[PDB]
C-alpha cells in the first residue's frame, strides 16, 4: 500500500543499488528471504524484480581474531564477499566493492590498520595496500566477480589507516590512497575509483576534494553517506550536489543511506533509529510509506541537481534482517532491522518497489 511519484527523465541505467554485505552471513546461518507475496525466493531475485540493479559490498581484510573466531557485523572477508558478488554479477547486477582497509568497521571515527599492518613502517605499508589490493581484485576476477566500481576506503573524511594516513599526514595519506588506486588499475584500468565521504557539509567537501585532486589522486566518483537523521535535511543534500557538479567534473554517488520503516524492535537489541527523536531530524516519518517517500525523493533530488553527473544511490543495511548470530557484533544483536527493506520475518517490504516505481 505504498504511494509513490515517478521521477521524470530518470535514466534506465541509474544506480538503484543496495548494500547487502550482511546477507551472505545471514543465509549461511539459515536466514530466509521472502518476496512481495511472502514465498521463499533467492534474495538477488527479489532485489532484481524490485528494481535493484547494483550491489554494494564491504570487504574487511581479516575480521577474525587470533583464535579464528569471527568479529561479526556480517563477517565480510574476501572469500565470502566474492562468492556473493560472483552470483550477483552472474544475475546481471553491477558490483561496487568497498575495501575498508581494516579488519572491521571503519568510518571517520575509527580507521584501524589491519592486525598484520599495525607495525609495518610507512614504506612497507604502501607495499601492503598495493599487493593486497592487487591480489584481492585478482581473486575476484577469477571467481568472475570483478567489481565495476571500487571504493578506496570507507568514509575517509579523516583519512584511513590511522595514524599513517590520518589526513593530518596528508602526504602519507595520498601515498597510500594512490598505492591502492595503482593496484586497481593494474588489474583493470576500466574499474572506476570511488572516493567516499560522510556528511553533506559542502564547505568540507570543497576543502577535502580540492586538496585531493591537486595531490594527483585520480578518481572517477565522489560517493556520499547521507543519513538524514544525522547529516541534514533534503535541502542540505541538494546544496551539496549542485556544489559538486559545478566545481568538479566527476560523478556523484550516494554510497550509503537509509531510513526507518518502523520504530519497533525485534531481537531485543536497541536500534540506532530508536525513538521519534531521529524521526524529526529526518523530516520523514518512520513508516513503510515514509521510508519509500524518502528514497524516491533522494533519487529525485540527486538527479534533478546532479543532472548528467548523477550516478545513483545505495540503500545501506537493506538485507540486514533480524536473525540469531547475524548481529552487528559477535554475541550482540541487530541495531538496524527497522531500517532494512525487509521486515523481521524476512519478507520484502512494499517499499522495496521504490527502485522500480520511480519509473513509468
Ligand atoms: Ca534490534
Ligand atoms: Cl605527512
UniProtKB/TrEMBL annotation:
<comment type="similarity">
    <text>Belongs to the glycosyl hydrolase 53 family.</text>
</comment>
<feature type="binding site">
    <location>
        <position position="334"/>
    </location>
    <ligand>
        <name>Ca(2+)</name>
    </ligand>
</feature>
<feature type="binding site">
    <location>
        <position position="337"/>
    </location>
    <ligand>
        <name>Ca(2+)</name>
    </ligand>
</feature>
<feature type="binding site">
    <location>
        <position position="271"/>
    </location>
    <ligand>
        <name>Ca(2+)</name>
    </ligand>
</feature>
<feature type="binding site">
    <location>
        <position position="269"/>
    </location>
    <ligand>
        <name>Ca(2+)</name>
    </ligand>
</feature>
<feature type="binding site">
    <location>
        <position position="265"/>
    </location>
    <ligand>
        <name>Ca(2+)</name>
    </ligand>
</feature>
<feature type="binding site">
    <location>
        <position position="267"/>
    </location>
    <ligand>
        <name>Ca(2+)</name>
    </ligand>
</feature>
<protein>
    <submittedName>
        <fullName>Arabinogalactan endo-1,4-beta-galactosidase</fullName>
    </submittedName>
</protein>
